[PDB]
Design a protein around this ligand. Structure first.
Ligand SMILES: CCCCCCCC/C=C/CCCCCCCC(=O)O[C@@H](COC(=O)CCCCCCCCCCCCCCC)COP(=O)([O-])OCC[N+](C)(C)C
Ligand SMILES: CCCCCCCC/C=C/CCCCCCCC(=O)O[C@@H](COC(=O)CCCCCCCCCCCCCCC)COP(=O)([O-])OCC[N+](C)(C)C
Ligand SMILES: CCCCCCCC/C=C/CCCCCCCC(=O)O[C@@H](COC(=O)CCCCCCCCCCCCCCC)COP(=O)([O-])OCC[N+](C)(C)C
Ligand SMILES: CCCCCCCC/C=C\CCCCCCCC(=O)O[C@@H](COC(=O)CCCCCCCCCCCCCCC)COP(=O)([O-])OCC[N+](C)(C)C
Ligand SMILES: CCCCCCCC/C=C\CCCCCCCC(=O)O[C@@H](COC(=O)CCCCCCCCCCCCCCC)COP(=O)([O-])OCC[N+](C)(C)C
Ligand SMILES: CCCCCCCC/C=C\CCCCCCCC(=O)O[C@@H](COC(=O)CCCCCCCCCCCCCCC)COP(=O)([O-])OCC[N+](C)(C)C
Ligand SMILES: CCCCCCCC/C=C\CCCCCCCC(=O)O[C@@H](COC(=O)CCCCCCCCCCCCCCC)COP(=O)([O-])OCC[N+](C)(C)C
Ligand SMILES: CCCCCCCC/C=C\CCCCCCCC(=O)O[C@@H](COC(=O)CCCCCCCCCCCCCCC)COP(=O)([O-])OCC[N+](C)(C)C
Ligand code: NA
Ligand code: NA
Ligand code: NA
Ligand code: NA
Lengths: 640, 63
């Protein structure tokens, strides 16, 4: 084009001597041009007209030893022509970079010196790169950081640029974006575990919060209605949680920005106070509630190890959840005994016209009481579990097994009763089959109530794992052999002579499959003479079945469990507290308002001037790094 | 490894026309007059930051 493409090259390969000669020619064209269409024209020449890109952008996307000199010349040239208000603050247009600017490029490309120049020249420090690349939908579609220059410098570990932007006086640190996320929401979004990144996101989290000096940021809710604290519990960032939930700011004049407070300390003994503002379930969407009910993450059982939550679970147990767990046991325990006895001691003779659970002929005070309590408590589970199964809305398959299995069996156990209670006086005679399943299901379910005890609870966690990792693999392969060798052995058995009808026990498929099952469990006798056409061939398939099943698969099953027990034993305690935590909160959601208030946690403490907060007292003993206790709330240690 | 053997044995059976459409990689210009077939893989690395000087396209992202 004889003006355009010659400049975009000169800024790229580091061509100073050429670039100067190009911009002089760019003036000579304009000395003939009027003094009104200068600014609108110079932009179209230093602009690509399809992407919105300019030459200051192209200069910084291609870094070189002469970048910093190209920036001096171009920004200088913008000054004489009076275009240093839209040239430095130019943005893309296409679809996926809408809002990205030269400052946005300088910060990522790690030119803090050039970034300082652009801000001094009047670069907008509050741009919003809102393009699709800057708001992906699949990580491995792009990169999200919060759309702001301050968030990029923080999310990319550039502390010197992060400090420079905050000191600038127009930097709106409290700015929100398309997702509603401010600077702190975005750091929670990009955080990762320590082996992946480093602890720098935690350090940027501290630096920006202290420099601000208020609770405005952590109080801000995003478009989904979430604070940075709630957002961390949802997305699963334990390292950032452990920082917030136990934050100490020793610097008086910033101590009110804390959540951990040293009430008193005398030597190695200390007493800390943990704020419970939006952690306890007094509010709608608390940290505790997210931690227990978030089925989208796979590290919940690490979260309830954090001290304010862990102590908070233990106290809810000591006060009301332990006692309710004992009552729920007793009502469900006598519930199954009643199902047992109305059934086992039914009127078998007379063809059982006065069905069990009838509420019929006269009375007797055990005959009447029992049959009422069942049909009521049957409906009570069905409604409760009917609601409960509907709320969580099973999305994936790992959740119902890991969070909801016992909820279904009680739904099934309750409906089988009610299915029976219909079929008694209304329809066919299969009511009995539904009632016998209800109790055998009912009695085996009692492993649920083991979880009040740690020892039996951890034991129950391992039963769950060993079934899903070992048994279902085992049962599948065993059946392909059991039915395969079964029909093969049954296919050989001749018709019995009419003299002896019972010439063989493999006379059919169902007969052979049963007898092979008997061998595996060690029950019965084994006669090789079975009226077969090919006896040595008949023995061959049988002994073959023994070697695969008796020698290999059964004993192999024991060996694979030992591998399961070894790996799972290091995690069964924390998974137990997760299931236990779910039990405590479900009890807690049932209690009325007046009974909820008296069992409210924490005591009201004065952590600062006119800042009365509810906190949790936890005592500690520390011997290692002694210090002079300067920060505290009460100089007289001890209670009261 | 066993799975890889299964994939290739299937692959040796397919006809020519059906082999071509399921051909892998996209044709990219890695250098001057050097058009090669390559495989795109995305990565995320946080540890050793640097100024990205060597690349093929200054406009990131697909297309
Ligand atoms: C002041 C006295 C109380 C006043 C009245 C308050 C009434 C409150 C009303 C509560 C709900 C009542 C209706 C039942 C709910 C339906 C569910 C069901 O059938 O089983 C329930 C029976 O387990 C229970 O714990 C409920 C029995 C009443 C609780 C005891 C009173 C409150 C605590 C008193 C303080 C004690 C400490 C005192 C220390 C000073 C729940 O069992 P589950 O196991 O959760 O659910 C089974 C299914 N699952 C296993 C799949 C989850
Ligand atoms: C789950 C994951 C494992 C997947 C592996 C799948 C296996 C893959 C390989 C399979 C090998 C092939 C075998 C089947 C084909 C031949 C059958 C045939 O010829 O006709 C039979 C059809 O079958 C019946 O009638 C079944 C009768 C019950 C016996 C088998 C139950 C075993 C189930 C297992 C236990 C758990 C089941 C749990 C699920 C329900 C005819 O039956 P019969 O005996 O002639 O009846 C009439 C004669 N009589 C009067 C003497 C009775
Ligand atoms: C026990 C074996 C040794 C154990 C160790 C295990 C290792 C060895 C495993 C060996 C596998 C099988 C062993 C079967 C045992 C003999 C059964 C038999 O003889 O049945 C009958 C023959 O019917 C047959 O089917 C004979 C065997 C056919 C060939 C088997 C090998 C596959 C070769 C296929 C070619 C492809 C391969 C080509 C190369 C790539 C006769 O037996 P019977 O009726 O009881 O006899 C009584 C006489 N009566 C009939 C008058 C009543
Ligand atoms: C530990 C593990 C096992 C637990 C299982 C429970 C223990 C064993 C259970 C029973 C003993 C069996 C012997 C026969 C006596 C039955 C009496 C009876 O009530 O029968 C009626 C059912 O009654 C009901 O369904 C009412 C429901 C409430 C009371 C249930 C009784 C046991 C409760 C506390 C149990 C302690 C539990 C622990 C408490 C913390 C109907 O039957 P019947 O025809 O009137 O019966 C006499 C028939 N006979 C003359 C032919 C004999
Ligand atoms: C109405 C029919 C009733 C029949 C039985 C009556 C008699 C009573 C018999 C059995 C009930 C007693 C056994 C369970 C004991 C407590 C739990 C336990 O120990 O661990 C596990 C038991 O493992 C399973 O649930 C695996 C799935 C098959 C189980 C087969 C029995 C029950 C379902 C029958 C099939 C019906 C299907 C029909 C279609 C709906 C817990 O279950 P999970 O969630 O799988 O494990 C989580 C694993 N995790 C730790 C990795 C997260
Ligand atoms: C039919 C099938 C029944 C279902 C299964 C029943 C399970 C098998 C029965 C018993 C197993 C005993 C194993 C030893 C326990 C030691 C470990 C432990 O956690 O101790 C706790 C026990 O103290 C409590 O108060 C918690 C349990 C109370 C609620 C349970 C009620 C329902 C089960 C009633 C069942 C009884 C009737 C059983 C017979 C019908 C200590 O208290 P904590 O407050 O947890 O503090 C933890 C402190 N620690 C960790 C430092 C220790
Ligand atoms: C078929 C005919 C008989 C009936 C059979 C029924 C049998 C069941 C009977 C009764 C119910 C008990 C069920 C088992 C409970 C779990 C055990 C337990 O906690 O062990 C713990 C050992 O440490 C102990 O303290 C266990 C000893 C307490 C029980 C003492 C015997 C009384 C119960 C009667 C039994 C004796 C009399 C025998 C006859 C009944 C190991 O648990 P853990 O998880 O490693 O943690 C523990 C603490 N820790 C963290 C410090 C290490
Ligand atoms: C005799 C009468 C009954 C028939 C018996 C035949 C039984 C077989 C029936 C049917 C075929 C199934 C065969 C087993 C499949 C492999 C297991 C598996 O993947 O285990 C995995 C966990 O467990 C699961 O992933 C399975 C849980 C989901 C399925 C739920 C049950 C439905 C199937 C019906 C069964 C329930 C009802 C019970 C009755 C059928 C463990 O594998 P891993 O290597 O650790 O990796 C996993 C992922 N990971 C990397 C994230 C860890
Ligand atoms: Na045996
Ligand atoms: Na035996
Ligand atoms: Na035996
Ligand atoms: Na071992």
């Amino acid at each position: 084009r004889r003006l355009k493409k010659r400049i975009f090259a000169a800024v790229s390969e580091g061509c100073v001597e050429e670039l100067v000669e190009l911009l002089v020619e760019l003036q000579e064209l304009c000395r003939r041009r009027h003094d009104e269409d200068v600014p609108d024209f110079l932009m179209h020449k230093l602009t690509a007209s399809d992407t919105g890109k300019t030459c200051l952008m192209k200069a910084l996307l291609n870094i070189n030893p002469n970048t910093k000199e190209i920036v001096r010349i171009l920004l200088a040239f913008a000054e004489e022509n009076d275009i240093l208000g839209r040239f430095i603050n130019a943005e893309y247009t296409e679809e996926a970079y809408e809002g990205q600017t030269a400052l946005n490029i300088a910060i990522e490309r790690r030119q803090g010196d050039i970034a300082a120049l652009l801000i001094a020249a009047g670069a907008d420090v509050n741009a919003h790169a809102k393009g699709a690349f800057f708001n992906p939908k699949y990580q491995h579609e792009g990169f999200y950081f919060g759309e702001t220059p301050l968030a990029l410098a923080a999310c990319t570990n550039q502390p010197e640029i992060v400090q420079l932007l905050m000191e600038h006086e127009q930097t709106d640190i409290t700015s929100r974006d398309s997702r509603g996320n401010n600077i702190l929401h975005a750091l929670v979004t990009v955080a990762e575990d320590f082996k992946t990144q480093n602890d720098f996101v935690k350090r940027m989290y501290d630096m920006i919060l202290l420099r601000s000096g208020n609770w405005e940021l952590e109080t801000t809710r995003n478009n989904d209605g979430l604070t940075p604290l709630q957002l961390a519990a949802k997305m699963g960032k334990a390292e950032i949680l452990k920082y917030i939930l136990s934050r100490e700011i020793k610097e008086k004049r910033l101590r009110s920005l804390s959540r951990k407070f040293t009430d008193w300390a005398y030597g190695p003994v200390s007493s800390s106070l943990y704020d419970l503002t939006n952690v306890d379930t007094t509010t709608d969407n608390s940290v505790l509630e997210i931690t227990v009910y978030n089925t989208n993450i796979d590290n919940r059982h690490e979260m309830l190890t954090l001290e304010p939550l862990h102590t908070l679970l233990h106290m809810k147990w000591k006060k009301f959840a332990k006692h309710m767990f004992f009552l729920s046991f007793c009502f469900y325990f006598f519930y199954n005994i009643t199902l047992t006895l109305v059934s086992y001691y039914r009127p078998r003779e007379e063809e059982a016209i006065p069905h069990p659970l009838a509420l019929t002929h006269k009375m007797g005070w055990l005959q009447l009481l029992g049959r009422m309590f069942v049909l009521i408590w049957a409906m009570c589970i069905s409604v409760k579990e009917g609601i409960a199964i509907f709320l969580l809305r099973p999305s994936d398959l790992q959740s119902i097994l890991s969070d909801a299995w016992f909820h279904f069996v009680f739904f099934i156990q309750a409906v089988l009763v009610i299915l029976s209670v219909f079929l008694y006086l209304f329809a066919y005679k299969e009511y009995l089959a539904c009632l016998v399943l209800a109790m055998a299901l009912g009695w085996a379910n009692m492993l649920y109530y083991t979880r009040g005890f740690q020892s039996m609870g951890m034991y129950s966690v391992m039963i769950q794992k060993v079934i899903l990792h070992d048994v279902l693999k085992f049962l599948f392969v065993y059946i392909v052999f059991l039915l395969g060798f079964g029909v093969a052995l049954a296919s050989l058995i001749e018709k019995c002579p009419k003299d002896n009808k019972d010439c063989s026990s493999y006379g059919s498929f169902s007969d052979a499959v049963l007898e092979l099952f008997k061998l595996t469990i060690g029950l019965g006798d084994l006669n090789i003479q079975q009226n077969s056409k090919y006896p040595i061939l008949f023995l061959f398939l049988l002994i073959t079945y023994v070697i695969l099943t008796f020698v290999l698969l059964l004993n192999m099953l024991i060996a694979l469990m030992g591998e399961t027990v070894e790996n799972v034993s290091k995690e069964s305690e924390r998974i137990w507290r997760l299931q236990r935590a779910r039990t405590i909160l479900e009890f807690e959601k049932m209690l009325p308002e007046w009974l909820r208030s008296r069992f409210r946690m924490g005591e009201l403490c004065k952590v600062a001037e006119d800042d009365f907060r509810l906190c949790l007292r936890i005592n500690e003993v520390k011997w290692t790094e002694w210090k002079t206790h300067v920060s505290f709330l009460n100089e007289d240690p001890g209670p009261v």
